[PDB]
Design a protein around this ligand. Structure first.
Ligand code: OGA
Ligand code: MG
Ligand code: NI
Ligand code: ZN
Length: 331
């Protein structure tokens, strides 16, 4: 079996290998990349996402989110308080202000220490989940706005034609902005490209061990767990690496820098934080290997997680028994 210790693998495709996205994902899995839950893909040196980022300041972040924490330093939840709209230019200036800028630090490890020590005491503002793309339309390779759609994948594998569309999202981050422990909707893959700015640190639990993380989470967030049998779908819980180690949860960590892609694999729980002002783009995608995970994916029916239009059809077709109760949650 390849990659039996479930390490995060890093790939350096040639320009030729960068042509066929599906085939390269399947190559990475042939080498065991998926066992980690997360892989890093460094593009060939000939590739670019677009010519420059000099003209992005006028993108609007309609609903910036202030991420307010509650709990203890290593075990906390965050809620998102909606703020007034601002442009990317305004946001970048806010991220660089004394109140929000990255502190002096030695290296990524020192900054990681400072994050876990101090995150809870601040409420950074995240421009998350903004529909759009920063890939040039002329970028033909690994263009996250030109991938094969999940609806088309389901049709190709299972023969059923369904409604729905699949588009990318932009994420504008600042120091301490945080993504909570989650898998993707319907345990899809995701791909994330760090277009610009400061890094993003990732933590991940191998898919084969995801239920270990879930069990810990139910212990650490006991009222959340009573309220909903899939509360990590709410995307509000954080657990530090120290806490994971104390509880014997298998995980790995890696820092993504600008210019790099990360791929999360089905049922690969992940969480992380941004080091400073940055912009990432991400999208969900599927492969044939996903179908079995989509059929088994947990679902939030308490009503909190409230997800896209396009998830309806996935639930309807892959999880018809759940469908009724799940949609009661959506309505
Ligand atoms: O970058 C972020 O804030 C979160 N991204 C993801 O969870 C992802 O790409 O799957
Ligand atoms: Mg602009
Ligand atoms: Ni994700
Ligand atoms: Zn729920």
């Amino acid at each position: 079996a390849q990659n039996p210790n479930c390490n995060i693998m890093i790939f350096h495709p040639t320009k030729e290998e960068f042509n066929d996205f599906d085939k390269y994902i399947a190559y990475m899995e042939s080498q065991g990349a998926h066992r980690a839950g997360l892989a890093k893909i460094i593009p060939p040196k000939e590739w670019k996402a677009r010519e420059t980022y000099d003209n992005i300041s006028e993108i609007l972040i309609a609903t910036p989110l202030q991420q307010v924490a509650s709990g203890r330093a290593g075990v906390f939840t965050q809620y998102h308080k909606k703020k007034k709209a601002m442009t990317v230019g305004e946001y970048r200036h806010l991220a660089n202000s004394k109140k929000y800028q990255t502190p002096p630090h030695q290296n990524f490890e020192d900054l990681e220490r400072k994050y876990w020590k101090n995150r809870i005491y601040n409420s950074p503002i995240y421009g998350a989940d903004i529909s759009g793309s920063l890939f040039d339309e002329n970028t033909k390779q690994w263009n996250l706005g030109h991938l094969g759609t999940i609806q088309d994948l389901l049709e190709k594998e299972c023969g059923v034609v369904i409604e729905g569309v699949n588009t990318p999202y932009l994420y504008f981050g600042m120091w301490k902005t945080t993504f909570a422990w989650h898998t993707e909707d319907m345990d899809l893959y995701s791909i994330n490209y760090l277009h610009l700015g400061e890094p993003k640190t990732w933590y991940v639990v191998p898919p084969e061990h995801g239920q270990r993380l879930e069990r810990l989470a139910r212990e650490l967030f006991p009222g959340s767990s009573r309220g909903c049998g899939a509360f990590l779908r709410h995307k509000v819980a954080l657990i530090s690496p120290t806490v994971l180690k104390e509880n014997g949860i298998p995980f790995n960590r890696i820092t993504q820098e600008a210019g790099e892609f990360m791929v999360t694999f089905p049922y690969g729980y992940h969480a992380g934080f941004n080091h400073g002002f940055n912009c990432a783009e991400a999208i969900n995608f599927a492969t044939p290997r996903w179908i079995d995970y989509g059929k088994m994916a947990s679902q939030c029916s308490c009503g909190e997680a409230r997800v896209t239009f396009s998830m309806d059809a996935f639930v309807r077709i892959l999880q018809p028994e759940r469908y009724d109760l799940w949609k009661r949650g959506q309505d």
